[PDB]
Amino acid sequence: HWGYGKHNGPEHWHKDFPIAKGERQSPVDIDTHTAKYDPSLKPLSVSYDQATSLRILNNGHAFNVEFDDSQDKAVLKGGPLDGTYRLIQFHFHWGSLDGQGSEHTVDKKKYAAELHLVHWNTKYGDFGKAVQQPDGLAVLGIFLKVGSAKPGLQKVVDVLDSIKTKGKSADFTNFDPRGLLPESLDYWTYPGSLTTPPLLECVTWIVLKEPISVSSEQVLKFRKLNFNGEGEPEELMVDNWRPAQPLKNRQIKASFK
Name the 3-class secondary structure at 210. coil
Radius of gyration of the chain (CA): 17
Residue in 14, 33, 61, 119 annotated catalytic: 61
Using the rule CB under 5 A, which residue among 116, 119, 166, 209 binds Ni ion?
116
Q: Write the DSSP symbol of residue 167.
A: T
Q: Which does 218 bind (CB under 5 to 8 A by kind): Ni ion, ligand MNP, none?
A: none
- Quick one: how far is CA 80 from the chain centroid? 18
What is the enclosing helix (H) or strand (E) of 155? helix 154-159
Please give the Cα distance from 4 to 21 (Å, whole number): 17
57 binds ligand MNP (CB under 6 A): no
Please give the Cα distance from 73 to 48 (Å, whole number): 7
Using the rule CB under 6 A, which residue among 106, 118, 160, 207 binds ligand MNP?
118
58 binds ligand MNP (CB under 6 A): no
Using the rule CB under 6 A, which residue among 25, 53, 58, 89 binds ligand MNP?
89
Rounded to a whole number of angstroms, the minimum distance from the CB of residue 40 to ligand MNP is 26
Question: Please, what is the end-to-end C-alpha distance for the chain in angstroms?
Answer: 44
196 binds ligand MNP (CB under 6 A): yes
Residue 61 among the catalytic residues: yes
Please give the Cα distance from 71 to 57 (Å, whole number): 21
Of residues 114 and 187, the one with the C-beta less far from ligand MNP: 114
Feature table: binding site for Zn(2+): 91, 93, 116
Residue ranges binding Ni ion (CB under 5 A): 1-2, 116
Catalytic residue numbers read 61
